[PDB]
Amino acid sequence: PKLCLVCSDEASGCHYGVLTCGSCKVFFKRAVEGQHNYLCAGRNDCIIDKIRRKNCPACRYRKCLQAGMNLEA
Amino acid sequence: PKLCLVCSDEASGCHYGVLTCGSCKVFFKRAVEGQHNYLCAGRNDCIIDKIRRKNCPACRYRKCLQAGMNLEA
DNA sequence: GAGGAAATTCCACGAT
DNA sequence: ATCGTGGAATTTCCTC
Ligand SMILES: [Zn+2]
Ligand SMILES: [Zn+2]
Ligand SMILES: [Zn+2]
Ligand SMILES: [Zn+2]
């Protein structure tokens, strides 16, 4: 019943300091390692869920950071 | 003329009835025969330009239709 | 020449 | 680390 704090999909455990699913954990790692320039086509307010998380890496990454995800955790 | 009526990128000609670039031509063909399930993570006003057009297929497809693109043209 | 469309290449995403 | 899937976009080939 525990949910990913980023996309609300069911969580696989505590990854990089935050309860998250597998895809969001892999996304965050790749985002930090690659130092990605992401641009929201919206207002930087996008809905991030299982379906929509692919739409805006910018808002997804922002949510990762604001939830406290860090590589050195 | 030039300037694709969907994303404002340089237009390659009149495709499916509308002045469009090459990428919006094949996008529309894919989307119109496909499901076009697309969900917007924003307010369905997403900015569609050369940089952001990949972010929201929902809004891109909506702009294709509003511009008047159709298969039977 | 135009434009439709397959073929091709590239990449994000995500499971294992 | 492979690696499958699917979308994106350019390149190549088709008919008219
Ligand atoms: Zn998640
Ligand atoms: Zn966004
Ligand atoms: Zn376009
Ligand atoms: Zn949108």
Experimental technique behind these coordinates: X-ray
**Which residue among B41, B46, B55 places its CB closest to the CB of A48?**
B41
Query: Could you check: is the Cβ of residue B13 within 7 Å of any atom of nucleic acid strand D?
Result: no
The answer to whether A21 and A69 are in contact (CB under 8 A) is: no
User: Which DSSP string corresponds to B10-43?
Assistant: PP-EEETTEEE-HHHHHHHHHHHHS------SSS
The answer to whether A41 and A56 are in contact (CB under 8 A) is: yes
Domains of chain A as residue ranges with CATH: 1-73 (3.30.50.10)
The CA dihedral of A30, A32, A36, A37, to the nearest 10 degrees, is: 140
Between CA A14 and C1' D14 the distance (Å) reads 55
The answer to whether B16 and B69 are in contact (CB under 8 A) is: yes
Query: Could you check: is the Cβ of residue A26 within 7 Å of any atom of nucleic acid strand C?
Result: yes
Resolution of the experimental model, in Å, one decimal: 1.9
Task: Label residue A18 exposed, middle or buried (CB < 10 Å: 0-12, 13-18, 19+).
Answer: buried
Instruction: Determine the distance in angstroms separating the CA of A42 from the nearest CA of chain B, rounded to an integer.
Output: 5
Between CA B10 and C1' C1 the distance (Å) reads 19
Write the CA distances from A23 to B18, B40, B64, integer angstroms.
Answer: 38, 20, 31
- Tell which of A46, A55, A56, A60 to mutate to test the B interface (max B CBs under 10 Å): A55
